[PDB]
């Protein structure tokens, strides 16, 4: 009686799963043209030239950021919410929100496309920060994220109006604590009757451990290229894995839910807005 993708589709349409929680990673942002490292990017990818990183992850580590913050702000310019548009996976999650089936959407991404697609902030946990807010690394004064937008887009480091220190967008670097809003998972995952895992290799803690927090009878559906994380080495009898292309996998589920017609219309209504 193991579950298939169609069975999960039947549980939503049957309304046996009404509290859907979703975990997303870079896999759902690749189709929108967003650059990734572990999988080269544009010419801006190898803009490391002139920048002597000890390793690519130093871009998200404070000690090197103090030394040279320009590598980060080069990436920030690229990923800044405005140059890229949501794809079908993002709109599949708003359509899930518009039907009142989404409890929370937990995201590792910082491209801000989750809110560009229409999901309100109250339904999002941006576990790895956001460009919506910023903080001076010297005097710790917070600022709204848009006070530094012009500086980043003009390739000039944003400076603090009070102490001239470097203003850093509230992006979680490695070795930094996650935002306390991440603690909503303590209540949200037990409350969930369905978990969706979209486009992530589950290599970033403590976000990856979230796959364990849903109760033992809750289906865990993985739409991903690879079988990763606990759904690989700690499986549960109610797990499902639609392995393959994330877009193709979401298209399949949408197809099995009979939402195709509504997805077409929603994507057309959202892309037409200027």
């Amino acid at each position: 009686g193991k579950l298939s993708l169609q069975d999960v589709a039947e549980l939503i349409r049957a309304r046996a799963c009404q509290r859907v929680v979703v975990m997303v990673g870079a896999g759902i942002s690749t189709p929108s043209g967003i650059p990734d490292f572990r999988s080269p990017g544009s010419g801006l990818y190898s803009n490391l030239q002139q920048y002597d990183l000890p390793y690519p992850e130093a871009i998200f580590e404070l000690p090197f950021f103090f030394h040279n913050p320009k590598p980060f702000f080069t990436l920030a310019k690229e990923l800044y919410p405005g140059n890229y548009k949501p794809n079908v996976t993002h709109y599949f999650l708003r359509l899930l929100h518009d039907k009142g089936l989404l409890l929370r959407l937990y995201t590792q991404n910082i491209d801000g496309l989750e809110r560009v697609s229409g999901i309100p902030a109250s339904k999002l946990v941006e576990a790895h920060g956001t460009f919506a807010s910023a903080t001076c690394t010297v005097c710790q004064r917070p600022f709204p994220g848009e006070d530094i937008r012009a500086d980043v887009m003009a390739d000039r480091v944003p400076r603090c109006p009070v102490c001239t220190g470097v203003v850093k967008p509230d992006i979680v670097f490695f070795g930094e604590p996650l935002p306390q809003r991440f603690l909503l998972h303590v209540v949200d995952f037990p409350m969930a009757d369905l978990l969706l895992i979209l486009g992530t290799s589950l290599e970033v803690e403590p976000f990856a451990s979230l796959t364990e927090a849903v109760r033992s009878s809750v289906p865990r559906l993985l739409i991903n290229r690879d079988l990763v994380g606990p759904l690989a080495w700690h499986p549960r009898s109610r797990d499902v894995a639609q392995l393959g292309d994330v877009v193709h996998g979401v298209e399949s589920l949408v197809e099995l839910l009979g939402w195709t017609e509504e997805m077409r219309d929603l994507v057309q209504r959202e892309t037409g807005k200027l």
Binding site: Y55, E57, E61, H128, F173, F174, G175, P177, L178, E205
Partner: peptide, 9 residues
Amino acid sequence: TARKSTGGW
């Protein structure tokens, strides 16, 4: 004095 981590650091 840490938490966010990925395979490497």
